[PDB]
């Protein structure tokens, strides 16, 4: 007792409930209101060209079949109740490998309001592909997208919308930022349509604008390259008669420029095109090699 009334309410709700059918299957279109809270913007992987993001993924929709009358206006139920009812089959269009967290128990919540409205939040770590053009590397900025929508329900059946104003519908926790070599300038949301052979689907888009931090690349490539160039330069002040000295300087500097070139190329992915750092390295290499040619002519 003291909960038999609630047990009866829940048992009545599920009784004669078909969770294979979306709410309002024939009468109307199921309107799912979506919201994202980013508890942490994970590190960006350039080699894999992906970023990790940990979020509270909130979805809300109205289910007439779940209307109830009871002492409580909102039923805060366990996650396991969510499997017995219809929930949207949202998927991430550009998601590579996403994990639904389950410690200690599935990180999901289901809340039912007496009017039939449902709130369904889950905790996720989404790994989404973020295509990048690295022609300006390491002084480059990217808008990493997070597209999501419904699998198996077209615009005519399930549509997605932001719970609140689109500008305020994707919220990033102030302290949640696991970026090391990037800066999160802001996020932008959009809504559109995906044209598919199976139909037309609603896609909700979010773009996170990142600008790469250059301090590490400065310290590891540009300052060493400038220092190698100057080390090659100082040979001119050296004595002409010290031919072995100047030869050692030149050859060692050229070897040093090759090792910096090869070590700098491995950091970024094996893209075909040439990045800004590549041009800087090439020009520094040319300068040191010209110093060697000048010593040879002398």
């Amino acid at each position, epitope marked *: 007792d003291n909960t038999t009334v609630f047990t009866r309410i829940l048992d009545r709700l599920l009784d004669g409930y078909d969770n294979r059918l979306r709410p309002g299957l024939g009468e109307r279109v199921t309107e799912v209101k979506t919201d994202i809270f980013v508890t942490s913007f994970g590190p960006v992987s350039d080699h894999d060209m992906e970023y990790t993001i940990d979020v509270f993924f909130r979805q809300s929709w109205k289910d007439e079949r779940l209307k109830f009358k009871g002492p409580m206006t909102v039923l805060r139920l366990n996650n396991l109740m969510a499997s017995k009812i219809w929930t949207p089959d949202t998927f991430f269009h550009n998601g590579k490998k996403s994990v639904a967290h389950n410690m200690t128990m599935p990180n999901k919540l289901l809340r039912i309001t007496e*009017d039939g409205t449902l709130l369904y939040t889950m905790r996720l770590t989404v790994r989404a592909e973020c295509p990048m053009h690295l022609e300006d590397f390491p002084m480059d900025a990217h808008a990493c997208p997070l597209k999501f929508g419904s699998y198996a329900y077209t615009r005519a059946e399930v549509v997605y919308e932001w719970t609140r*104003e*689109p500008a305020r519908s994707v919220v990033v926790a102030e302290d949640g930022s696991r970026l090391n070599q990037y800066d999160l300038l802001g996020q*932008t949301v*959009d809504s559109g349509i995906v044209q598919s052979s199976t139909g037309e689907y609603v896609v909700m888009t979010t773009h996170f604008h990142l600008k790469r931090k250059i301090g590490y690349f400065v310290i590891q490539t540009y300052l060493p390259c400038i220092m190698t160039v100057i080390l090659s330069q100082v040979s001119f002040w050296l004595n002409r008669e010290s031919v072995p000295a100047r030869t050692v300087f030149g050859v060692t500097t050229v070897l040093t420029m090759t090792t910096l070139s090869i070590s700098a190329r491995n950091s970024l992915p094996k893209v075909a095109y040439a990045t800004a750092m590549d041009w800087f390295i090439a020009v520094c290499y040319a300068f040191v090699f010209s110093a060697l040619i000048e010593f040879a002519t002398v």
Partner: antibody, heavy 117, light 106 residues
Framework: VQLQQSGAELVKPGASVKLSCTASGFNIKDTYMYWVKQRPEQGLEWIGRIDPANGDTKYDPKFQGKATITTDTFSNTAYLQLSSLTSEDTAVYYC???????????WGQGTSVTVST | NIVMTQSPKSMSMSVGERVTLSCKASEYVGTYVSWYQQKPEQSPKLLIYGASNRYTGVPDRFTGSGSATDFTLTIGSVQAEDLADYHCGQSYSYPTFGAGTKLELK
């Protein structure tokens, strides 16, 4: 499907006025309710919005205190009340409903709120 | 506060030919720009929701487009019923409307 907004009201300057927007054919709890004023032969300007299910209200930064949006879910009605009325408040006030892509799909007939002696 | 600059402020273009209304936004408002029609002494009527979507029961001569900040509304052929004030509004953030442009025939 239709918002039966109240009638035109004549208000002496400095006197508060209550404007009601009655919704039918839908539950205001479902969507947001908006209030928009249009000056005579001028562009629309958003006043504020209410989320009746939650009860939260946001305002155009220029309307803090000068306006107050409230709802009555039981009455399925939205109310706009202006604290103080001046010569600048003699406009037409509209009630609108949030739509598909956050568009104001349904608008009320409007209320003429003239401030004069 | 996104400011929607709507131009031209007025038009007297001849009936039967193309009409182009261009609405520009101060900031990014992805596709949440809507076009409302306001016939004289009457409440506005929604024409375009989102960018390039028509509302139910709207003449097919109306069509919009726009991506980030440049949005336009096009009428294939004007009619006597199209003599009305048109306003562009954004809903990406707290709503703001444009100045509205009047359409006239002559």
């Amino acid at each position: 499907v239709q918002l039966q907004q109240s009638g035109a009201e004549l208000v002496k300057p400095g006197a508060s006025v209550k404007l009601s927007c009655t919704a039918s054919g839908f539950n205001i709890k479902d969507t947001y309710m908006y209030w928009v004023k249009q000056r005579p032969e001028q562009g629309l300007e958003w006043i504020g919005r209410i989320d009746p299910a939650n009860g939260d209200t946001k305002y155009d930064p220029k309307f803090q205190g000068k306006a107050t949006i409230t709802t009555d879910t039981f009455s399925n009605t939205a109310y706009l009340q202006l604290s103080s009325l001046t010569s600048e408040d003699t406009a037409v006030y509209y009630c609108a409903r949030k739509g598909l892509r956050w568009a104001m799909d349904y608008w009320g007939q409007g209320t003429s709120v003239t401030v004069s002696t | 506060n996104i400011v929607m600059t709507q131009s031209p402020k007025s038009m007297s273009m001849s009936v039967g030919e193309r009409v182009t209304l261009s609405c520009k936004a101060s900031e990014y408002v992805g596709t949440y720009v809507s076009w409302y029609q306001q016939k004289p002494e009457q409440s506005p009527k929604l024409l375009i929701y989102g960018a390039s979507n028509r509302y139910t029961g709207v003449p097919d001569r109306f069509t919009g487009s726009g991506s980030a900040t440049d949005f336009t509304l096009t009428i294939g052929s004007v009619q006597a019923e199209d003599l009305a004030d048109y306003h562009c509004g954004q809903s990406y953030s707290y709503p703001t409307f444009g100045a509205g442009t009047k359409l006239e025939l002559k």
